[PDB]
């Protein structure tokens, strides 16, 4: 099994995988307990103990992003979508599919979404009800300044929907300090669970009033929450093994020292990565002042010999799975620095990368 | 870990769980291969090699049922929903939420949906475009006669959407003999995978023409299929470990002798169950002539001492998790006979049941 240097699904600890060796009953109180501990550990992290509720959902994070747009953004609401990358585009496609009146702020891939340009467009038309953005655009690993953007959004009585899939668990987000109606994350990223379940931190009072709003049965967070309030059970088949794994990964996250411990490791991995790759002659697409310690985009070698598909295949053989580029304009590739990986796996990865290239991109 | 005598999530083999000990890359060709083998093994079973395509989906089977109603049933289409149980009700809620013009045939819980009453209502109004039903209502384990109903539906140029979640893998369904536009199943039932992914066998030509129809991004089987045609990849995060488990469970299903081998075991489990429970003084809710070998509903003991929650708890301690009743009118409970369980675990379960009751329901 190669190490996965991707934005998830990623390399998980074996504790994490062990947890899946157990079959649970979805009706069973033990599983009801498991579910509740997961929700409360999650709600603990985001700092939403008083004001929000953690609604878990089957499927990927996109499922839960849609679920949140669907259940919280009303029929008569306009959303500003910030779109500085691929995740941002998905937000646009989701509002459209839900035919939700919406408006787009595309700010190109190499530069952050600014509080400033969010300010002007908001001032224009009080029509807009909601603002939606991605915290970390994994397409390039740009970190958007959410705290600056949240404050600017709140200052205008508009409401924030934050996609924190790639960043939740690793970049500090505190609910009482970053006002939002919805933060969405998933199981298989910075928390280091396996993939297969999403969750939404929704404001208690927004969700309670959202009864009937959702365009979807399966993705109705109000119906989901209400039923789970009542019975402690999921409406529909839960992915039991995924929830257990996430519970166990949450155990490890707490043991290791929480967000700061997870952030320190990733920041360290991010450095070793940039450090070693620079020493190979690689340029990062982003300079350090904007670079999230989640995933690094690197300019492809100019060498007319360079083939990503080749380069990927040789590095796999040496025990490391990298990630393709996602930019239309300049050829690149990506290396994650997250999951159950330390500074020393990073340098072995770069050393492998170097070896792969010497057969024969120069 | 107790044995799960439920309709799933259920007791899985350990081969199945072992498969999850591996992290896969969603972009990785190995995982692309894994995904394709799963789809083709699935498409093989339902007999849809020539006419249908297996679209896999994240989340539970309900997610894929919605996905199929959403992507295949047009804006200008009326659906007849057959509703002889809880699964049937969900179908009604889904068409409503999708605001799909629809109509209901409720036939009570103890008697099958008949080809005859489907015939009349169809003749009434050619408005109806689609018919939807559950093959096995797990609420009672009634088997609906789908072959009789399919033929009656086809005979009227209407189109069938079949929820086969509880029955697929164990009751014979052949595509060239049972005309349908969509059969939906999931990973965590009669196939004995773990839960966490759905799939839809959609008619090749219906799905190809469904471009844009879906009410959902996440649940758009056309967009999902098209993208997977192109890249061999899932649009969004796949639950890699779930797909691997299902692959491995599909391996075992093929080794053991396919549908007939799976059916023989379950029919045998079903007998031992009925056999032993009768010998305790239990009455099944259904007589043998209608009873699917999936799950058995049993009349609760009349004894004013009887408490399901108590009865459940003691049987758990003895290594068996049963299932609550789901009927509004008469008190019952349910015992599954599916998953990785043989005739001899069935009799140990009944013997435990007997023991649990002797402390002190009489």
XYZ file of C-alpha atoms in Angstrom:
724
model
C 0.000 0.000 0.000
C 1.661 3.276 -1.125
C 1.419 6.358 1.071
C -1.321 8.659 -0.267
C -0.022 12.216 -0.644
C -3.444 13.488 -1.775
C -6.119 15.759 -0.168
C -7.981 12.605 0.904
C -8.914 9.862 0.756
C -5.531 9.577 2.462
C -3.219 7.403 4.536
C -5.049 6.488 7.750
C -3.552 5.066 10.933
C -4.147 1.366 11.515
C -5.980 2.076 14.766
C -8.412 3.873 12.455
C -8.837 0.864 10.135
C -8.957 -1.580 13.099
C -12.098 0.154 14.344
C -13.885 -1.086 11.198
C -13.330 -4.751 12.175
C -16.645 -4.545 14.110
C -20.209 -4.885 12.792
C -22.692 -2.553 14.540
C -26.471 -2.541 14.570
C -27.928 0.762 13.323
C -30.858 0.328 15.722
C -28.492 -0.671 18.535
C -28.007 1.660 21.515
C -24.223 1.059 21.377
C -24.217 2.532 17.879
C -26.551 5.287 19.075
C -23.931 6.007 21.714
C -21.120 5.872 19.144
C -22.988 8.338 16.909
C -23.557 10.793 19.789
C -19.910 10.786 20.928
C -18.861 11.491 17.341
C -21.270 14.424 17.050
C -20.180 15.922 20.372
C -16.452 15.491 19.667
C -17.035 17.197 16.300
C -19.155 19.977 17.815
C -16.427 20.363 20.419
C -13.732 21.027 17.812
C -15.528 23.804 15.863
C -16.389 25.433 19.217
C -20.169 25.306 18.637
C -21.218 23.783 21.982
C -23.694 26.605 22.654
C -24.979 27.810 19.270
C -24.735 25.016 16.710
C -25.608 21.378 16.237
C -23.591 18.716 14.398
C -25.819 16.997 11.812
C -24.013 13.921 10.352
C -24.770 12.747 6.841
C -24.015 9.748 4.628
C -21.744 10.208 1.599
C -19.012 12.697 0.704
C -18.636 16.306 1.856
C -20.224 17.591 -1.361
C -23.379 15.715 -0.273
C -23.325 17.692 2.970
C -22.505 20.964 1.214
C -25.550 20.478 -1.002
C -27.452 19.375 2.102
C -26.604 22.675 3.798
C -27.367 24.879 0.770
C -30.591 22.893 0.424
C -31.874 23.053 3.983
C -30.690 26.449 5.208
C -30.784 28.712 2.131
C -34.513 29.503 1.595
C -36.606 29.670 -1.575
C -36.452 33.505 -1.473
C -32.711 33.844 -0.811
C -29.789 34.970 -2.961
C -26.326 33.541 -2.362
C -22.990 35.085 -3.199
C -20.605 32.281 -4.196
C -16.865 32.955 -3.944
C -15.122 30.861 -6.607
C -11.280 30.883 -6.668
C -10.977 27.195 -7.577
C -12.674 23.902 -8.374
C -14.485 23.529 -5.043
C -15.853 27.049 -5.559
C -17.229 26.055 -8.976
C -19.100 23.121 -7.387
C -20.855 25.615 -5.102
C -22.074 27.417 -8.220
C -23.332 24.220 -9.836
C -25.186 23.318 -6.602
C -27.093 26.585 -6.224
C -27.978 26.365 -9.913
C -29.181 22.749 -9.717
C -31.228 23.645 -6.643
C -32.296 26.656 -8.732
C -31.331 28.961 -5.881
C -31.035 32.660 -6.913
C -27.284 33.194 -6.670
C -24.330 35.351 -7.714
C -20.654 34.596 -8.331
C -17.337 36.179 -7.299
C -14.541 34.587 -9.336
C -11.141 35.757 -8.208
C -8.724 33.541 -10.128
C -6.680 30.694 -8.684
C -3.448 32.252 -7.426
C -4.938 34.998 -5.231
C -7.214 34.849 -2.111
C -10.851 35.864 -1.951
C -10.676 39.253 -0.209
C -12.921 40.751 2.476
C -12.778 43.939 0.396
C -14.449 42.709 -2.793
C -16.999 40.801 -0.705
C -17.810 44.132 0.924
C -18.652 46.031 -2.274
C -20.914 43.432 -3.886
C -22.780 43.018 -0.606
C -23.390 46.780 -0.309
C -24.805 46.738 -3.864
C -27.909 44.577 -3.323
C -29.419 43.542 0.088
C -31.073 40.846 -2.032
C -28.229 38.471 -1.186
C -29.155 36.383 1.857
C -26.102 34.116 2.137
C -22.397 33.971 1.398
C -20.653 30.716 0.501
C -16.937 29.970 0.232
C -14.246 27.337 0.494
C -11.739 27.763 3.354
C -8.923 25.891 1.562
C -9.087 25.475 -2.222
C -7.401 22.090 -2.586
C -7.030 22.848 -6.307
C -3.968 24.887 -5.291
C -3.968 24.822 -1.478
C -4.740 28.523 -1.258
C -6.026 29.520 2.169
C -8.890 32.008 2.047
C -9.056 34.379 5.083
C -12.335 33.178 6.557
C -12.205 35.154 9.807
C -11.803 38.414 7.872
C -14.598 37.344 5.507
C -16.944 36.140 8.270
C -16.765 39.456 10.131
C -17.454 41.392 6.916
C -20.441 39.152 6.156
C -21.894 39.388 9.694
C -21.379 43.170 9.602
C -24.070 43.207 6.892
C -26.574 40.773 8.402
C -25.829 38.297 5.596
C -25.185 34.642 6.496
C -22.067 32.505 5.912
C -21.872 28.956 4.582
C -18.314 27.632 4.874
C -16.951 24.585 3.052
C -14.168 23.455 5.421
C -13.701 19.983 3.977
C -9.970 20.235 3.349
C -9.200 22.408 6.379
C -11.429 21.337 9.274
C -9.378 19.698 12.055
C -6.116 21.397 11.015
C -6.814 25.111 10.678
C -8.242 26.835 13.737
C -11.918 27.614 13.390
C -13.760 28.804 16.500
C -17.531 29.289 16.213
C -17.885 32.135 18.729
C -15.234 34.116 16.850
C -16.091 33.177 13.273
C -19.879 33.687 12.823
C -21.369 31.210 10.347
C -24.692 29.422 9.827
C -23.031 26.327 8.374
C -19.582 24.830 8.379
C -19.313 21.550 6.454
C -16.513 19.012 6.754
C -16.123 15.261 6.106
C -14.565 12.145 7.671
C -11.668 11.376 5.338
C -9.491 14.513 5.456
C -7.590 16.370 8.235
C -9.433 14.370 10.935
C -7.848 11.286 9.329
C -10.996 9.175 9.346
C -11.867 7.008 6.377
C -14.160 8.681 3.774
C -17.901 7.976 3.744
C -19.661 10.497 5.955
C -20.194 14.242 5.933
C -21.304 16.587 8.703
C -22.689 20.108 8.968
C -22.317 22.424 11.922
C -25.562 24.358 11.566
C -26.732 27.180 13.822
C -29.326 25.666 16.234
C -31.992 28.298 15.485
C -31.495 28.431 11.693
C -31.857 24.635 11.331
C -34.904 24.525 13.659
C -36.623 27.047 11.367
C -35.582 25.260 8.161
C -38.341 22.652 8.474
C -39.466 21.803 4.946
C -36.910 23.931 3.052
C -34.673 21.117 1.779
C -34.979 20.133 -1.908
C -34.047 16.584 -0.910
C -35.290 13.831 1.361
C -31.907 12.145 1.786
C -30.092 15.442 2.324
C -32.627 17.159 4.631
C -30.598 18.183 7.687
C -33.683 19.423 9.508
C -35.555 16.152 9.039
C -32.303 14.337 9.854
C -31.724 16.388 12.991
C -35.348 16.180 14.197
C -35.441 12.405 13.820
C -32.078 12.043 15.546
C -33.271 14.292 18.361
C -36.252 11.986 18.821
C -34.795 8.496 18.436
C -30.982 8.933 18.593
C -31.034 7.109 15.260
C -30.229 7.907 11.639
C -33.237 8.102 9.327
C -31.603 5.809 6.811
C -28.819 3.250 6.709
C -25.750 4.731 8.457
C -22.250 3.594 7.335
C -21.551 2.078 10.757
C -17.879 1.115 10.069
C -17.187 4.655 8.800
C -18.619 6.199 11.975
C -16.555 3.818 14.156
C -13.350 4.641 12.223
C -14.071 8.358 12.591
C -14.694 7.816 16.289
C -11.314 6.079 16.630
C -9.595 8.733 14.502
C -11.217 11.327 16.768
C -9.780 9.415 19.720
C -6.276 9.684 18.264
C -6.713 13.359 17.395
C -7.597 14.098 21.036
C -4.688 11.959 22.400
C -2.125 13.575 20.084
C -3.104 17.035 21.403
C -6.068 18.271 19.280
C -6.050 20.988 16.595
C -2.657 22.566 17.580
C -0.935 19.158 17.608
C -2.462 18.295 14.203
C -1.560 21.767 12.875
C 2.047 21.539 14.078
C 2.651 18.196 12.338
C 1.096 19.401 9.058
C 2.966 22.739 9.114
C 6.102 20.713 9.692
C 5.277 18.308 6.815
C 4.497 21.295 4.652
C 7.942 22.777 5.350
C 9.921 19.589 4.702
C 7.954 19.261 1.447
C 8.676 22.818 0.228
C 12.222 22.480 1.607
C 13.133 19.277 -0.215
C 11.309 20.133 -3.436
C 13.043 23.528 -3.674
C 16.332 21.596 -3.309
C 15.285 19.542 -6.338
C 14.595 22.706 -8.348
C 10.815 22.760 -7.851
C 8.782 25.931 -7.614
C 5.592 26.067 -5.561
C 2.691 27.820 -7.312
C 1.962 29.820 -4.140
C 4.528 31.786 -2.028
C 4.684 30.912 1.688
C 2.577 33.914 2.772
C -0.577 32.333 1.294
C 0.249 28.604 1.466
C -2.004 26.396 3.582
C -0.188 23.340 5.091
C -2.720 21.050 3.391
C -1.543 20.500 -0.218
C 1.234 22.029 -2.343
C 0.848 22.759 -6.056
C 4.174 22.701 -7.947
C 5.022 23.910 -11.472
C 5.567 20.958 -13.792
C 9.172 20.613 -15.112
C 9.531 22.443 -18.431
C 11.294 19.339 -19.846
C 9.475 18.163 -23.031
C 10.100 14.645 -21.689
C 7.911 15.251 -18.603
C 4.736 13.179 -18.521
C 2.693 13.329 -15.334
C 1.200 9.890 -16.020
C 4.733 8.431 -16.210
C 6.002 10.464 -13.270
C 3.000 9.361 -11.181
C 3.488 5.687 -12.057
C 7.181 5.488 -11.040
C 6.585 7.331 -7.745
C 3.736 4.921 -6.960
C 6.145 1.962 -7.406
C 8.423 3.617 -4.835
C 5.598 3.801 -2.294
C 3.940 7.224 -2.760
C 0.779 8.291 -4.585
C 0.847 11.954 -5.646
C -1.928 14.042 -7.201
C -2.516 15.477 -10.727
C -2.708 19.191 -11.551
C -6.098 20.930 -11.709
C -5.179 24.169 -13.527
C -6.255 24.991 -17.053
C -3.470 27.464 -17.796
C -0.179 26.101 -16.468
C 0.909 22.495 -16.074
C 1.382 21.525 -12.436
C 1.078 18.594 -10.038
C 0.195 18.351 -6.359
C 1.628 16.798 -3.217
C -0.441 16.572 -0.029
C 1.169 16.841 3.379
C -1.798 15.581 5.410
C -3.033 12.276 6.793
C -1.085 9.869 8.982
C 2.358 10.995 7.772
C 5.292 12.770 9.472
C 8.180 15.017 8.397
C 10.286 11.919 7.621
C 7.799 10.287 5.234
C 7.767 13.649 3.452
C 11.502 13.564 2.799
C 11.396 9.930 1.651
C 8.628 10.972 -0.763
C 10.735 13.818 -2.188
C 13.778 11.576 -2.459
C 11.594 9.083 -4.382
C 10.299 11.943 -6.555
C 13.901 12.863 -7.329
C 14.735 9.263 -8.274
C 11.668 8.924 -10.473
C 12.722 12.006 -12.443
C 16.355 10.916 -12.996
C 14.895 8.230 -15.212
C 15.042 10.820 -17.340
C 13.416 14.299 -16.955
C 16.230 16.791 -16.642
C -19.745 -8.502 18.814
C -23.301 -9.957 18.774
C -24.669 -11.490 15.587
C -26.945 -8.969 13.840
C -30.288 -10.562 12.960
C -31.504 -7.374 11.237
C -32.191 -6.413 7.564
C -28.739 -4.787 7.469
C -26.406 -3.392 8.479
C -25.701 -7.036 9.287
C -23.081 -9.603 10.247
C -20.359 -9.546 7.581
C -17.668 -12.150 6.974
C -14.189 -11.223 8.165
C -12.804 -11.502 4.639
C -15.220 -8.638 3.969
C -13.891 -6.498 6.845
C -10.251 -7.438 6.046
C -10.621 -5.797 2.641
C -11.031 -2.445 4.435
C -7.523 -2.687 5.958
C -6.225 -0.953 2.782
C -6.176 2.767 1.938
C -6.864 3.483 -1.759
C -6.361 6.620 -3.805
C -9.594 7.826 -5.443
C -7.565 9.126 -8.397
C -5.539 5.903 -8.508
C -5.958 3.507 -11.446
C -6.027 0.538 -9.024
C -9.126 2.039 -7.428
C -10.481 2.829 -10.893
C -10.016 -0.855 -11.635
C -11.646 -1.856 -8.339
C -14.654 0.365 -9.102
C -15.090 -1.123 -12.601
C -14.955 -4.751 -11.414
C -17.598 -3.924 -8.807
C -19.887 -2.342 -11.405
C -19.506 -5.254 -13.823
C -20.013 -7.919 -11.136
C -23.160 -6.039 -10.063
C -24.392 -5.595 -13.641
C -23.682 -9.287 -14.130
C -25.984 -10.329 -11.281
C -29.108 -8.376 -12.359
C -28.563 -9.701 -15.907
C -28.271 -6.222 -17.472
C -25.074 -6.764 -19.496
C -26.745 -5.597 -22.719
C -29.391 -3.024 -21.752
C -28.458 -1.362 -18.468
C -25.558 0.327 -16.749
C -24.583 0.113 -13.069
C -24.236 3.640 -11.641
C -22.684 3.488 -8.115
C -23.480 6.155 -5.559
C -22.257 7.252 -2.130
C -24.558 6.822 0.881
C -27.474 4.509 1.663
C -29.921 2.892 -0.763
C -32.505 5.617 -0.112
C -29.942 8.062 -1.564
C -29.868 5.962 -4.728
C -33.646 5.533 -4.792
C -34.024 9.310 -4.681
C -31.194 9.522 -7.215
C -33.156 7.292 -9.595
C -36.513 9.049 -9.102
C -34.616 12.311 -9.571
C -32.679 11.523 -12.729
C -35.017 9.235 -14.663
C -38.538 10.448 -13.810
C -38.994 13.682 -15.849
C -40.553 17.024 -14.924
C -43.721 16.087 -16.880
C -44.142 12.556 -15.500
C -46.615 10.999 -13.073
C -45.557 8.081 -10.891
C -47.732 5.421 -9.340
C -46.236 4.494 -5.957
C -47.155 1.109 -4.474
C -47.059 1.434 -0.680
C -47.614 -1.747 1.402
C -45.060 -0.807 4.069
C -42.513 1.669 5.389
C -40.184 1.544 2.376
C -43.220 2.258 0.184
C -44.034 5.358 2.254
C -40.489 6.683 1.694
C -41.121 6.483 -2.058
C -44.131 8.746 -1.542
C -42.160 11.257 0.513
C -39.435 11.323 -2.185
C -41.711 12.077 -5.136
C -43.381 14.754 -3.019
C -40.098 16.371 -1.936
C -38.936 16.325 -5.554
C -42.426 17.695 -6.268
C -42.954 14.972 -8.850
C -46.634 14.524 -9.899
C -47.443 11.162 -8.333
C -50.190 8.807 -7.161
C -50.372 6.202 -4.395
C -51.578 2.591 -4.130
C -51.705 1.615 -0.451
C -52.525 -2.034 0.008
C -52.019 -2.629 3.726
C -49.138 -4.515 5.311
C -50.192 -8.168 5.393
C -51.117 -8.593 1.713
C -49.026 -8.265 -1.522
C -49.311 -5.511 -4.093
C -51.233 -7.220 -6.911
C -50.754 -7.020 -10.682
C -54.547 -6.699 -10.846
C -55.003 -3.423 -8.965
C -51.959 -1.990 -10.750
C -53.764 -2.806 -13.988
C -56.947 -0.835 -13.266
C -55.341 2.395 -12.057
C -52.999 2.349 -15.044
C -55.901 1.964 -17.501
C -57.579 4.980 -15.848
C -55.077 7.721 -16.761
C -52.193 7.434 -19.326
C -50.857 10.435 -17.401
C -48.795 8.094 -15.230
C -45.304 7.716 -16.696
C -43.662 5.470 -14.088
C -44.423 2.784 -11.538
C -42.413 2.431 -8.332
C -42.423 -0.387 -5.784
C -40.438 -2.250 -3.169
C -39.594 -5.897 -3.969
C -39.359 -6.958 -0.300
C -41.011 -4.796 2.367
C -38.601 -5.349 5.251
C -41.271 -3.898 7.558
C -42.832 -7.378 7.464
C -40.741 -9.324 4.938
C -43.613 -9.522 2.477
C -42.446 -10.405 -1.024
C -44.212 -8.442 -3.749
C -44.548 -10.330 -7.095
C -42.327 -8.111 -9.219
C -42.258 -10.279 -12.346
C -46.067 -10.264 -12.507
C -46.069 -6.504 -11.863
C -43.279 -5.727 -14.353
C -45.078 -7.486 -17.210
C -48.322 -5.641 -16.414
C -46.464 -2.314 -16.348
C -44.581 -2.965 -19.621
C -47.856 -4.094 -21.227
C -48.981 -0.462 -20.864
C -45.813 1.334 -21.966
C -45.341 2.641 -18.412
C -41.894 2.361 -16.795
C -40.831 0.479 -13.639
C -38.603 1.699 -10.820
C -37.809 -1.161 -8.434
C -36.417 -0.762 -4.918
C -34.574 -4.080 -4.442
C -32.507 -3.043 -1.440
C -33.543 -5.887 0.846
C -33.840 -8.514 -1.893
C -31.107 -7.929 -4.478
C -28.522 -10.746 -4.407
C -30.925 -13.272 -2.839
C -34.115 -13.248 -4.893
C -33.732 -13.967 -8.595
C -34.085 -10.872 -10.726
C -33.175 -11.166 -14.410
C -33.238 -7.965 -16.481
C -34.224 -9.523 -19.821
C -37.230 -11.162 -18.161
C -38.245 -8.425 -15.734
C -38.414 -5.131 -17.717
C -37.472 -2.126 -15.579
C -35.819 1.269 -16.087
C -34.230 1.238 -12.634
C -33.431 -1.350 -10.027
C -31.755 0.062 -6.905
C -29.843 -1.931 -4.308
C -27.108 -1.183 -1.737
C -23.875 -2.674 -0.356
C -24.859 -3.743 3.153
C -27.703 -6.241 2.627
C -28.018 -9.622 0.822
C -24.664 -9.074 -0.948
C -23.154 -8.965 2.561
C -20.969 -5.929 1.952
C -20.631 -3.249 4.593
C -23.118 -0.328 4.256
C -22.053 2.951 2.640
C -22.746 2.788 -1.079
C -25.815 2.506 -3.273
C -26.148 1.547 -6.930
C -28.764 1.874 -9.657
C -29.169 -0.411 -12.630
C -30.548 2.100 -15.118
C -31.545 1.362 -18.707
C -28.651 2.588 -20.935
C -30.899 4.680 -23.208
C -33.102 6.186 -20.465
C -30.077 7.423 -18.466
C -28.342 8.793 -21.600
C -31.446 10.909 -22.275
C -31.804 12.038 -18.649
C -29.096 14.696 -18.993
C -30.124 17.615 -16.790
C -33.248 16.034 -15.245
C -31.873 15.374 -11.751
C -32.981 17.718 -8.933
C -29.606 17.126 -7.282
C -25.931 17.542 -8.057
C -24.740 14.830 -5.669
C -27.445 12.388 -6.754
C -27.313 12.981 -10.539
C -26.802 9.516 -12.033
C -26.459 10.911 -15.541
C -23.732 13.361 -14.546
C -22.208 10.585 -12.423
C -22.322 8.086 -15.273
C -21.027 10.533 -17.913
C -18.064 11.549 -15.770
C -17.282 7.926 -14.947
C -17.499 7.033 -18.629
C -14.936 9.741 -19.347
C -12.418 9.410 -16.516
C -13.201 6.059 -14.810
C -13.451 8.173 -11.662
C -16.158 9.204 -9.211
C -17.160 12.865 -9.366
C -16.805 13.245 -5.626
C -15.088 11.477 -2.756
C -15.795 7.724 -3.050
C -15.904 5.602 0.157
C -12.902 3.560 -0.989
C -12.948 1.037 1.929
C -16.673 0.413 1.332
C -16.078 -0.327 -2.357
C -13.196 -2.701 -1.496
C -15.337 -4.547 1.091
C -18.149 -4.866 -1.450
C -15.639 -6.139 -3.987
C -14.451 -8.794 -1.518
C -18.029 -9.660 -0.534
C -18.772 -9.981 -4.254
C -15.787 -12.320 -4.487
C -17.251 -14.551 -1.775
C -20.725 -14.465 -3.313
C -19.281 -15.742 -6.609
C -17.149 -18.450 -4.872
C -20.073 -19.719 -2.778
C -22.129 -20.262 -5.964
C -23.906 -16.940 -6.757
C -27.611 -16.111 -6.340
C -28.848 -19.762 -5.999
C -26.213 -20.542 -3.348
C -27.111 -17.348 -1.434
C -30.839 -18.104 -1.843
C -30.479 -21.689 -0.607
C -28.697 -20.641 2.601
C -31.251 -17.895 3.353
C -34.254 -20.144 2.600
C -32.666 -22.660 4.929
C -32.086 -20.019 7.654
C -35.634 -18.845 7.156
C -36.951 -22.373 7.766
C -34.895 -23.064 10.896
C -36.102 -19.685 12.199
C -39.818 -20.363 11.577
C -39.265 -23.966 12.718
C -37.684 -23.159 16.073
C -39.879 -20.150 16.822
C -43.069 -22.146 16.165
C -41.693 -24.699 18.669
C -41.458 -21.864 21.198
C -45.084 -20.879 20.554
C -44.367 -17.988 18.174
C -46.621 -17.038 15.299
C -45.218 -15.455 12.147
C -47.236 -12.479 10.872
C -47.116 -13.894 7.326
C -47.967 -17.509 6.268
C -45.272 -19.375 4.306
C -46.924 -18.765 0.911
C -45.978 -15.060 1.030
C -42.881 -15.104 3.271
C -39.610 -13.873 1.781
C -36.491 -15.561 3.308
C -35.155 -12.123 4.272
C -36.778 -11.144 7.607
C -39.555 -12.673 9.733
C -42.097 -10.588 11.644
C -43.496 -12.382 14.720
C -46.501 -11.518 16.919
C -45.346 -10.199 20.284
C -46.238 -12.464 23.273
C -49.586 -11.420 24.754
C -47.981 -11.553 28.240
C -48.462 -8.166 30.010
C -44.889 -8.684 31.250
C -43.459 -8.560 27.697
C -41.268 -5.543 27.010
C -39.421 -5.504 23.702
C -36.720 -3.226 25.131
C -36.068 -5.791 27.896
C -36.361 -8.761 25.556
C -33.930 -7.110 23.115
C -31.394 -6.344 25.852
C -31.170 -9.910 27.244
C -30.870 -11.469 23.767
C -28.064 -9.017 22.955
C -26.148 -10.216 26.062
C -26.456 -13.765 24.702
C -24.881 -12.748 21.393
C -27.770 -11.799 19.062
C -29.220 -8.432 18.050
C -32.855 -8.666 16.917
C -35.065 -5.962 15.406
C -38.070 -3.943 16.723
C -41.586 -4.092 15.266
C -42.677 -1.523 12.668
C -46.474 -1.995 12.716
C -48.902 0.552 14.086
C -51.730 -1.880 14.803
C -50.316 -5.041 16.369
C -47.237 -5.441 18.538
C -44.546 -7.513 16.846
C -40.777 -7.912 16.580
C -38.493 -9.017 13.762
C -35.706 -11.522 13.216
C -33.541 -11.386 10.087
C -32.157 -14.535 8.520
C -29.630 -12.851 6.218
C -25.969 -11.879 6.328
C -23.046 -14.156 7.135
C -25.085 -16.631 9.208
C -26.044 -20.304 8.723
C -28.874 -22.606 9.833
C -26.979 -23.356 13.070
C -26.564 -19.732 14.183
C -30.319 -19.452 13.635
C -31.088 -22.219 16.113
C -28.653 -20.825 18.693
C -30.450 -17.479 18.300
C -33.863 -19.067 18.921
C -32.536 -21.027 21.881
C -31.195 -17.725 23.285
C -34.574 -16.091 22.584
C -36.229 -18.882 24.555
C -33.837 -18.383 27.483
C -34.325 -14.626 27.496
C -38.091 -15.103 27.798
C -37.953 -17.637 30.671
C -36.702 -14.750 32.758
C -40.021 -14.290 32.935
C -42.506 -13.817 30.021
C -44.791 -16.819 30.034
